[PDB]
Design a protein around this motif. Sequence first.
Motif, mmCIF file in Angstrom:
data_model
loop_
_atom_site.group_PDB
_atom_site.id
_atom_site.type_symbol
_atom_site.label_atom_id
_atom_site.label_comp_id
_atom_site.label_asym_id
_atom_site.label_seq_id
_atom_site.Cartn_x
_atom_site.Cartn_y
_atom_site.Cartn_z
ATOM 1 N N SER A 185 0.794 -1.218 0.000
ATOM 2 C CA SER A 185 0.000 0.000 0.000
ATOM 3 C C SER A 185 0.831 1.275 0.000
ATOM 4 C CB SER A 185 -0.947 0.024 1.212
ATOM 5 O OG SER A 185 -0.220 0.064 2.427
ATOM 6 N N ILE A 186 2.133 1.191 0.267
ATOM 7 C CA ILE A 186 3.017 2.355 0.282
ATOM 8 C C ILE A 186 3.960 2.346 -0.917
ATOM 9 C CG2 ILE A 186 4.915 3.470 1.510
ATOM 10 C CD1 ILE A 186 2.508 1.585 3.635
ATOM 11 N N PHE A 187 4.726 1.267 -1.087
ATOM 12 C CA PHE A 187 5.657 1.173 -2.204
ATOM 13 C C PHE A 187 4.982 0.750 -3.502
ATOM 14 C CE2 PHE A 187 7.822 -0.037 1.762
ATOM 15 C CZ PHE A 187 8.728 1.000 1.858
ATOM 16 N N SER A 188 3.768 0.212 -3.430
ATOM 17 C CA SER A 188 3.051 -0.220 -4.624
ATOM 18 C C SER A 188 2.277 0.937 -5.247
ATOM 19 C CB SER A 188 2.100 -1.371 -4.291
ATOM 20 O OG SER A 188 1.091 -1.501 -5.277
ATOM 21 N N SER B 227 -1.622 1.685 -11.027
ATOM 22 C CA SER B 227 -0.461 0.943 -10.552
ATOM 23 C C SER B 227 -0.073 1.316 -9.127
ATOM 24 C CB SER B 227 0.727 1.170 -11.489
ATOM 25 O OG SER B 227 1.818 0.337 -11.139
ATOM 26 N N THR B 228 -0.408 2.526 -8.680
ATOM 27 C CA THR B 228 -0.089 2.972 -7.332
ATOM 28 C C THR B 228 -1.263 2.861 -6.369
ATOM 29 O OG1 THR B 228 -0.575 5.257 -7.979
ATOM 30 C CG2 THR B 228 1.717 4.527 -8.124
ATOM 31 N N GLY B 229 -2.473 2.641 -6.872
ATOM 32 C CA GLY B 229 -3.635 2.524 -6.007
ATOM 33 C C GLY B 229 -4.102 3.837 -5.416
ATOM 34 N N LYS C 88 -0.681 9.868 -0.634
ATOM 35 C CA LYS C 88 0.213 9.530 0.460
ATOM 36 C C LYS C 88 1.562 10.222 0.273
ATOM 37 C CE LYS C 88 -2.005 4.999 0.926
ATOM 38 N NZ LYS C 88 -1.858 3.550 0.618
ATOM 39 N N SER D 270 4.559 8.517 -0.202
ATOM 40 C CA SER D 270 5.303 7.834 -1.256
ATOM 41 C C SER D 270 4.738 8.145 -2.635
ATOM 42 C CB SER D 270 5.300 6.326 -1.008
ATOM 43 O OG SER D 270 3.993 5.857 -0.721
ATOM 44 N N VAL D 271 3.436 8.422 -2.723
ATOM 45 C CA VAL D 271 2.840 8.750 -4.013
ATOM 46 C C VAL D 271 3.133 10.195 -4.399
ATOM 47 C CG1 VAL D 271 0.784 8.348 -5.403
ATOM 48 C CG2 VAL D 271 1.029 7.221 -3.180
ATOM 49 N N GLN E 255 6.590 10.403 -6.013
ATOM 50 C CA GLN E 255 6.716 9.675 -7.270
ATOM 51 C C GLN E 255 6.003 10.377 -8.419
ATOM 52 O OE1 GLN E 255 6.072 5.424 -7.016
ATOM 53 N NE2 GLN E 255 5.361 5.304 -9.143
#
Lengths: 53, 150, 96
Positions: free
Chosen positions: A37-40, C27-29, C78, C80-81, C84
Motif C-alpha cells: 500500500s506504500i511502495f506499490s 499501478s499505485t492505487g 500519500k 510515497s505517491v 513519485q
Amino acid sequence: IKLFLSTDDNLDLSIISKYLLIASYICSYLEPRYDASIFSNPRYLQPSLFAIE
Amino acid sequence: SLLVKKYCKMTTEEIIRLCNDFELPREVAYKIVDEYNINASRLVCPWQLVCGLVLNCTFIVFNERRRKDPRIDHFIVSKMCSLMLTSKVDDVIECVKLVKELIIGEKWFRDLQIRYYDEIIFRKLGSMLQTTNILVTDDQYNIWKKRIEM
Amino acid sequence: KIYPKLHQMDMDKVSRVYADLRRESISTGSFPITVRHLESILRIAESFAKMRLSEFVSSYDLDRAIKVVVDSFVDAQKVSVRRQLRRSFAIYTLGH
C-alpha cells in the motif's frame, strides 16, 4: 569556562551501501503485510528479522 | 516536420496505410501495429517509433533488391521524407538507429531475419569475440560506396 | 458579456495528460480518475481567459489549468505517491 561546562567527550560509505541500510531499517521495524500500500513507536524495541528477497 | 510533434493521437488505420505504401505483407504489418499498442505510453514522439519500425523491416524484406540495385536504398529514404514533411536527411538516419536498439532483443525480430542465433550465442556465453555494436556492418558500407558513384 | 471559446486548442495535449494520470493511479492505487476530471480542466482554462478579458483560450491558459488539477491530485495522496508523481508529471508543469 570551556573546561567545566562539558566533559569534552573522551578524546565515507558507498551509495549502494547507504541505501541498503535504509531498506533494512524498514523491514526490521514494520510489518510486511502492509507493504503493498506504500511502495506499490516500534523503533524503541528490538528490531525484527526479515528475508533476503 | 512530423517528427517534432509530441504526443500524437494515432488511430488504428494510420499504421496500416503507412505500411501499404512500402509494399509490406500482412504478416509483418500486424507486428508493427501490435508493437504500438503495448507501447502506447512511455514515449516522446509517436511518429519516431512508427517511422523507425517501418524502415527497419524494409531492408530485411527487400534485401534481395538492395544488393542488385543500389538505387533502392536511396529511393526508400526520400519517400519517407515527403510523408513526414521533413527536409533534413540526418533525422531519418537518427530515427532508424534508436528504434533498432529497442527491437534488437525480441522474438518477432529474430524470425524476420532468419526467413528473409549466430550473434546471440556469444552475448549470453560471455565470449570476447562477439560482434560489437560500434563499427558499421559490412553490408551497409557496400551500399554507401555505390551511392556516391551514381 | 465576455464568453471565451475553445477554438484553436491542443486537443492532443489534453488526451496525453489524462492518459498518463489514469495509468499512474492504477499501478499505485490512488484515486481513480473518471471522465468528470477531464471536464474540470476546460472549466479552469475558461476561467483563466475571463481574467484576461479574452474571447479565446490560448495555449498559456491550458498549461495553467493542468497544473492546478495536478497539484490538487498529487498532494491529495500519500507520502510515497507524492514523491513519485512529482517526478513523472514534472514535464507538463514546467512549461516552456
